[PDB]
Amino acid sequence: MIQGVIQKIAGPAVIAKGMLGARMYDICKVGEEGLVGEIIRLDGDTAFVQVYEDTSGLKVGEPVVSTGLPLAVELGPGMLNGIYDGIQRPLERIREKTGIYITRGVVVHALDREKKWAWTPMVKPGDEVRGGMVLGTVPEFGFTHKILVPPDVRGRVKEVKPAGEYTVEEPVVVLEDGTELKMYHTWPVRRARPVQRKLDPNTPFLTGMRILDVLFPVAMGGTAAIPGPFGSGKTVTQQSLAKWSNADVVVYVGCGERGNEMTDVLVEFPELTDPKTGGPLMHRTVLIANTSNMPVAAREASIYVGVTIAEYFRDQGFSVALMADSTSRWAEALREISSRLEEMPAEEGYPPYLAARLAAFYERAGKVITLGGEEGAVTIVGAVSPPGGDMSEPVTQSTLRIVGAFWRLDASLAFRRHFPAINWNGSYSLFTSALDPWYRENVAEDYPELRDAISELLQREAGLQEIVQLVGPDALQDAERLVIEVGRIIREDFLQQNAYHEVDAYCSMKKAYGIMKMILAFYKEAEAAIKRGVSIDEILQLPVLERIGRARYVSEEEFPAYFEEAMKEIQGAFKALA
Amino acid sequence: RRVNALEQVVIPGIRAQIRFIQQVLEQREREDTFRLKRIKGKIEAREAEEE
Amino acid sequence: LLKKEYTGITYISGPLLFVENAKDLAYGAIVDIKDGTGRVRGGQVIEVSEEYAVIQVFEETTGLDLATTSVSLVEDVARLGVSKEMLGRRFNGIGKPIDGLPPITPEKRLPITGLPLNPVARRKPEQFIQTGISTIDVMNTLVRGQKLPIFSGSGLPANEIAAQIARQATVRPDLSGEGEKEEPFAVVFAAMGITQRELSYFIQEFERTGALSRSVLFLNKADDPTIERILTPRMALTVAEYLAFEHDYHVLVILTDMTNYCEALREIGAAREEIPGRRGYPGYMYTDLATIYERAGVVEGKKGSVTQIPILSMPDDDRTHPIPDLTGYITEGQIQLSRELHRKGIYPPIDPLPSLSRLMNNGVGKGKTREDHKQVSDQLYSAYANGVDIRKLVAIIGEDALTENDRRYLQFADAFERFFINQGQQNRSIEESLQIAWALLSMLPQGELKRISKDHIGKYYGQKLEEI
C-alpha cells in the first residue's frame, strides 16, 4: 500500500508527503488512531487529505496509509430500523463501546455479521446473470429483500447454496469464472447507480397536508425545496411527511441540525403505526444523523450515503422518499474545505462549483425502469436555511433552477401561529397539469374545477387586500365584503392544519374535497342571498358557519355522515333566511 | 387619513429598502477588497523564488 | 515530567508568532511564553508543520523580542481541573481564583472542548419549570434541558429578568407526583466583557438571595485581554457537564452578552485572514456557536440535567443580524424583549409574538400542569394577533369607524397588555396565570373560540378580573 507521513496539520485538513502513486478521491487512514480521510489534491510528492474526524492532538510525522478505494457503503439486508453516522457507522453499536460520548477512531461494520438470514434461491446452475438481476429473496420486517447482482457483474452461475440460514458474508452463488457473490456489495457513493430508462411521473406523492396536496402537488419521482427562516416550520413539515406519506421506505438525513430532533424520531417512531401496514413505523425508516457539533467534513458524506441508500432501495422495486434536513450546512462544509484549500471564492465565500454539486444531487431523483425490469422511483424534498430569510442568496437561487416544486415559507404567518405557514402567493408547482387525469378518476370528475374556483377566490382576496388596509373594510360594497369573509374562512378553516392534533394531523383527499365543496356552496348561497338584498351581518352571524369551522377536526370515520348533514343544513339555513 | 397613511406605511418601507440596499452594496465592497488582499500577497510571493 | 523549551522565534506580528524548530508540538497544545523580564504569557498552537509552527497569544505582544523569548510546552490538550469544592468560588476566566482563597485540588482533568453527546444516549426533556412569569410559563414554557436565549436590546433590562428567573425557578413535582422535596438548582455564571456596574448588581443580587453558596462564577471583565473571552464559556460548560453528569446536580448556566463573544471571534478571524461571512464575521461561526449550545440536555439513565439561558443584545434591534440569526438556528427558542412595551413602563417587557419555545408540546398536557394549557395558549396567540392588527388599522382610520367586534378585540388587546404581561416582581403560580388567562378570554363571545374544544369551554368561562 502507498504509505507516507504527515507534513502539515491545519484544522480539518492534513497534508501528507511520500504519497507518490496515490489516486484522487481515495480513502486514507491518517495518524496512529486511523482517522478516515480523502484525497482531494495531488501536488508532486504530497497529497491533500480532508479528515472526517477531529484532528486535535495530532503530531507531524505520524504514518498515513492509503486504502486505494473511494468512499463506499455496504448495501445489503439489515439497513432498515437503524440509525447511522455520516460515514455509515451504527450509533447504537458505538454506544455500547464508548458510552454517552462519541470518541474518534471507532471502527464498526455497517451490516451485522452475526445475524442469520433465511435464504431462498431463485436461480439455478447454468443460468446467465447480468447486472441488476435477482438471485434470491430474504425476509425482513414485513418486506421481501432481494439479493441483487452487482451492476458490473456478468457471467454464468456454477453453483447455488440451497435454502437455509446464513450470514451476510457467506457466498450463496459462485459464478463460472470463480467470482463469489454474497448477500451484500459495496458501491462508491459519488457515482449514480445505472438504470434502463427514465419515465414521466404521473402519480401523486401524498403528504397528508391539504395545502401541499391540493394547491401545490408534487408527483411520484419529482423534487421540491422548502426554504424558510428560523421558526417557520421546515422540520415539523418534514417529520409529518415522514409519518404520513404513502412511500414504502423513508430515508431521513439529518445533515447538520439539532440532536434533540434526532432523539424525538428515535423515541416516537417505534410506537406509531405504519400507514399502509400493521407494523411499527420505524420498521420502514432509515436514519442518517450528523448533528451540528459533530465534525464538519462529515456533513458532505452523509448526503451521498443517504442518496445511495435511497437509490439502492429503488432498484428493488420500492418507492422511496428522501428528506434532507438542511443543505445549507453542506454548502458551509464545502465553503470551509475551500477556505482551507486557498481557492478563490465566487460569492459569499462559496466555492464556484456549488451549483454543479447541487445539480448532481437533485438529478438522482426520478421514476425509472430498473435493470431487473421492475419499476421504482425516488422523490427528494430538501430544506434550505437562508440567512435572514433572504431568498436571493446563492444557495436558494441555485436550487430553484433544478427543482420542480417550490414551497415558500413566511415568517409573518408563523408569528400569528398560522402553521404550516406556506405562502400561497410566492409558491408554485410544475406537476399540476400532469396529475389531472389521475385526479379525475381517483378523486372526482370535477376536482380541478373546484381547485381553480378556490384559486380565483384567493387571488381576488389578495387583490382586495391592497384596498382594505388603508381605506376601511366598511367602505367596500357587500359584494366585496363577502369575498373578504369567504377568504378569511378559506384561510382559517381549510389551509390551516395542526400537526399536533389527534385527528387534524392527517387528511385524506376526499375530506379535503368535501371541505372545498362545502365552502364553495356556502359562497354561492351567500351571493344569492346578497342578490336578494340581505345585509351581510345576518349572514356572518348565521349558525351554519360554525359547522365549517369545526369540520377539519371531524375524524375520517365520521366525515361521510357529517358532510351530508352540513350540506343539507347550508341550504336549509340559506332558504330559511329572509 | 392621508397624513396618517403617509406617516405609518409609506416611510418605514422606504427606509427598510434604504437599509437593505446599503447592506448589499457594503457586503459586495468587502468581497471585492478581499480579492485584492489575496492578489497582493500572491504578487509578493511570486518575486521571491530566487530573488 | 521534564520540560522542553524552544528558542527559535523567527517572526512576530500581531497575535501570531512563528517558532522554527517546533516539530514535536501537538496541534492544539497550550504553551507558556516567557520574555526577558520574567513575565509569562499563554498561547495555543493553531498550525504545525515541518518548517515551523504558528502560535497565537492569549493577550498583547508588547515586550517580546527574538533574542530572549522562549516557548515552553505545558500540555497537549487544553484541560481544566474540576472538583466538587468549586461551589462558592470565583475565577478570572482562565481558571485562576480571584477571591483570594487557595486553589482547589482537582479530582479529574477534562478537555475544555468537550465531546459530542451520542444522539442515541439522549432522552426527551419532559419536566416543566415554573419560573413565575406569566408570559413565559403559559405561552413559552421552559423545560429542564432546554437552551432558551433572551434577545435583549441596547438599554433593556435583560439582567433583571435573568436574575428573577434564577431566583424563582422551581419544578413543581406535585402537579405530576414524580418526586418530592424541594431539590434546588445549582447555578454556573459566566460573564464575557461585562462591566463593573452590571457585575456589582449581579453580585449583590446573588448575595441577597443567598444562592452564592451554591454557585460558581467565571468573570472576564471588559478590560481583560480579548482572547480570554473565547475560553470562558467552554470551561463553564465543562464544569456544568461534570457536575450534572457525575454528581446528579441540576445546573443552570447563564451566559452574559455573547455578542461580545462574537466580536471576540471576529477579531481573531480577521487576524487570521480567513474567509468572512455576511457582515465580516468568519464563515465558521455556526459551528463554533454549535459547539457551545449543544452541550446542554438530559441523558438517559442519569439523574442530572443542564439548562442554558444565554443573553445577547440585538444590534440596533435588527433581528436579521448574523448573531441573532445564527443563534435562532441552533437554540430551541428565544425570548424577545420589546422597546415599545418598555417605554410605557411595562415590566417585564416580554414581546409575545416573536417569542417562541419549541419544547412546549411535550412538557404540558394531561398528567402535567393541566389539559387546557395548549388550547388556551393557541387562542391567546390568535386573539392577540387579531387585536394587534385591529390596533394598527385604527391608527390610520380612527376609532370612529370600528365595528363592535373589532372594538372588543382592541379592548382585549389593551387589557391583555396591561394585566397579563405587566406583573413587576410578583411571583405568580401556574394556576393563577391560567386563571388570569381564562379571565381575559371571557371578553370574547363563545363563537370566537375556535381553537378550544367545547369540553373546556363552560368548565372555565365567564369569570371576571379579580386581581387588584
Ligand SMILES: Nc1ncnc2c1ncn2[C@@H]1O[C@H](COP(=O)(O)OP(=O)(O)O)[C@@H](O)[C@H]1O
Ligand atoms: N404544522 C404545524 N402545526 C403546529 N405547529 C407547528 C407546525 N409547524 C411548525 N410548528 C411550530 O414551529 C415550531 C418550530 O418550527 P421548526 O420545525 O423548528 O422550524 P425550523 O426547523 O425551520 O426552525 C414548533 O414549536 C411548532 O410548534
Ligand SMILES: [Mg+2]
Ligand atoms: Mg429545524
